[PDB]
Design a protein around this nucleic acid. Structure first.
Lengths: 93, 191, 235, 41, 67
RNA sequence: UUUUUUUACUUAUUCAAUGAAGCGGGGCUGGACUUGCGUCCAACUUCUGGAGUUAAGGUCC
């Protein structure tokens, strides 16, 4: 029904678009995904937004991977409200 | 005496369907006024046959098939739970609780009358040979009919020897000396 | 082509027809008394109400954080018997050549263990991280220790396996282990592990550790209660 | 279905937080009788 | 050490934690034999102050008597 | 917050049975009522003093 948007930060180096899609496709269907990157160098800014088809699946994944210690990084996984999700958040995804 | 007169243990076959047994012998039990019937059933879990010992109802005979279980027919010698019998049916060897293998109405000529049912809370009102009214669980089993050997006490014993032969195999106290025939040290009625 | 002399002889396993086949009767096995006792002990501990100081031990580190803690603590295992013999031989040669044993031996960094020793370190506020086994019998040996760590401001975590801590400390069983200080190349890893414990265990169990445990019903009791409440709702 | 999607999410969370060894092997016992095992003498 | 804490906790026999532990241990010891061997003392501070040591040659036997 | 009443539960305790054998909740099939699909209730052997036990068989290797 209602789609879910999860903001994930503290991304370790190597944990990028394909890795994120493959990992969270185990939790549920991913409709959109975008990793924030610098246009001058192409390097990742260690944050990303994942837009799941199902809000309960997004919520379960966020509580699962919140504060996860991965390669020296304690991952941040939060669910953004539909009121505070930006209309142009997934341009270029 | 060889074996006690008890029903089969309440198992899956008696709880959900019926099991057939064959009456092989009707024998005299020393000390008991009622004859006993040896009935052979099949074991549902193994090849070996199981022999039981019931109190023989009047009309039962050697070579007769009896049926024990929930779905058994309303016929003399058949063992049914009291929930499966209509009101006014007389039964014998009635269990006070399901699985005690028979406690009520066991002597010769005696029976228990099924007075009524309470299906909402699962009970059965019965009338005992003493005239008392009792409430028992409806899954307690009973053999349809009257215990054989009735009218035993109608005949006078007529002889001290016959009373002695009655009680010597029964281990009751015989002869009986009166209390007033005793000394004051022996009985409160003594003297 | 199959042999026409082959025949099928199906068995009807209804009531009063054939001998019943050999089934799995494992639910109804007459168990030995020690097995029955341990199973009913676990069941009774679930059925009764557990006070919070005991029920807090049901909340434990997850697989990833436990693996990271063990990955750090496996570098600081205590000195073995052969290693101690070699070190004592080197120190004996140093004394023979006329040098102090501190001139040949370096200050050691190991995982601290032993319940009295760890409690003393926590009271002296020297411990940086405390790991407490979840299965200590008697439970009174560790039932005060989370509260002691909270009073002294020590990061603690409940972890699965006193045998697992014993593998760290070369023992069969350790009730509690502590990290006081590590080497400079592992200071960052220790700080990251401490922050990971603080953010992923303690903040999550902050509210659940104050609740009562147990009080769960058996399967048939739950089904009877469900039938009762649907009967009451229908009526 | 929504129940299937939720079950998939719960299974993924369980695998992430506890591992994949979720099942145990249990002996089938044809009898209700337990015997003392035969050990070396 | 921890045994001071165990002493002060064992003084509080009417508290919830000690009361629950006493209840479950009473059930377990009632299901066990009248005389049986304890693998370890269930009150280590009490056993230690009465003289028990974790050395080969010290054993603990649990017993119940009718009162 | 405590004290009475009655009024349910089960985990202490108590009784009984069994070779601790089929308990409880679902699924499949049929029958009923219902609502227009939830309950409850049934699966299996009754002319005969025979016999019933070492899985037949199907399907992947």
């Amino acid at each position: 029904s209602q789609p879910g948007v999860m903001y994930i930060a503290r991304l370790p180096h190597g944990f990028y678009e394909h890795e994120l899609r493959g990992y969270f496709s185990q939790f549920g269907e991913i409709t959109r995904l975008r990793v924030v990157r610098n246009k001058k160098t192409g390097a990742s800014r260690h944050r990303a937004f994942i837009e799941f088809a199902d809000a309960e699946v997004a919520d379960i994944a966020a509580r699962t991977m919140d504060k996860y210690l991965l390669f020296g990084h304690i991952l941040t996984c939060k669910i953004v409200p539909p009121a505070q999700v930006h209309p142009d958040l997934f341009k270029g995804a | 005496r060889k074996a006690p007169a008890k029903f089969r243990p309440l198992d899956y076959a008696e709880r959900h369907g019926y099991i057939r047994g064959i009456v092989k012998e009707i024998i005299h039990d020393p000390g008991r006024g009622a004859p006993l019937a040896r009935v052979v059933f099949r074991s549902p879990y193994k090849y070996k046959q199981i022999t039981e010992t019931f109190i023989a109802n009047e009309g039962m005979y050697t070579g007769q098939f009896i049926y024990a279980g929930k779905n058994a027919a309303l016929t003399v010698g058949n063992i049914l739970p009291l929930s499966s019998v209509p009101e006014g049916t007389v039964v014998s060897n009635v269990e006070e609780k399901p699985g005690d293998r028979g406690a009520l109405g066991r002597t010769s000529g005696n029976y228990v009358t099924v007075v009524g049912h309470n299906p909402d809370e699962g009970k059965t009102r019965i009338k005992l040979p003493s005239g008392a009214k009792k409430v028992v669980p409806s899954s307690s089993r009973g053999m349809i009919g009257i215990v054989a050997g009735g009218g035993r006490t109608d005949k006078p014993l007529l002889k001290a020897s016959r009373a002695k032969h009655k009680f010597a195999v029964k281990r009751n106290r015989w002869p009986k000396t009166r209390g007033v025939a005793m000394n004051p040290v022996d009985h409160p009625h003594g003297g | 082509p199959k042999n026409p002399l082959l025949e099928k002889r199906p068995r009807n396993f209804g009531i009063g027809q054939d001998i019943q086949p050999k089934r799995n009767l494992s639910r109804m096995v007459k168990w030995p008394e020690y097995i029955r006792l341990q199973r009913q002990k676990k069941i009774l501990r679930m059925r009764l109400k557990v006070p919070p100081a005991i029920a807090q031990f049901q909340y434990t580190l997850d697989k990833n954080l436990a693996a990271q803690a063990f990955k750090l603590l496996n570098k600081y295992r205590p000195e073995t018997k052969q290693e101690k013999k070699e070190r004592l031989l080197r120190e004996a040669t140093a004394i023979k050549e006329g040098k102090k044993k501190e001139d040949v031996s370096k200050k050691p960094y190991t995982v601290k263990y032993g319940l009295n020793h760890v409690v003393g370190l926590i009271e002296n506020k020297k411990a940086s991280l405390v790991l407490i086994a979840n299965d200590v019998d008697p439970i009174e040996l560790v039932v005060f220790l989370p509260a002691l760590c909270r009073k002294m401001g020590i990061p603690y975590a409940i972890i699965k396996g006193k045998a697992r801590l014993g593998t760290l400390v070369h023992k069969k069983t350790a009730a509690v282990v502590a990290i006081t200080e590590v080497r400079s190349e592992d200071k960052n890893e220790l700080a990251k592990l401490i922050s990971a414990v603080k953010e992923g265990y303690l903040e999550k169990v902050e509210d659940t550790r104050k609740r009562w445990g147990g009080g769960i019903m058996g399967f048939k009791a739950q089904k009877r209660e469900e039938k009762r409440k649907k009967s009451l709702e229908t009526a | 279905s929504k129940a299937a999607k939720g079950a998939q999410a719960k299974k993924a969370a369980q695998a992430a937080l506890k591992g994949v060894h979720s099942h145990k092997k249990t002996k089938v016992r044809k009898s209700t009788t337990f015997h003392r095992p035969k050990t070396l003498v | 050490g921890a045994l001071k804490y165990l002493e002060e906790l064992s003084k509080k026999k009417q508290s919830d934690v000690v009361r629950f532990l006493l209840r479950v241990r009473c059930w377990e010891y009632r299901q066990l034999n009248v005389i049986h061997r304890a693998s370890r003392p269930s009150r280590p501070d009490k056993a230690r102050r009465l003289g028990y040591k974790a050395k080969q040659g010290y054993v603990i036997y649990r017993v119940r008597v009718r009162r």
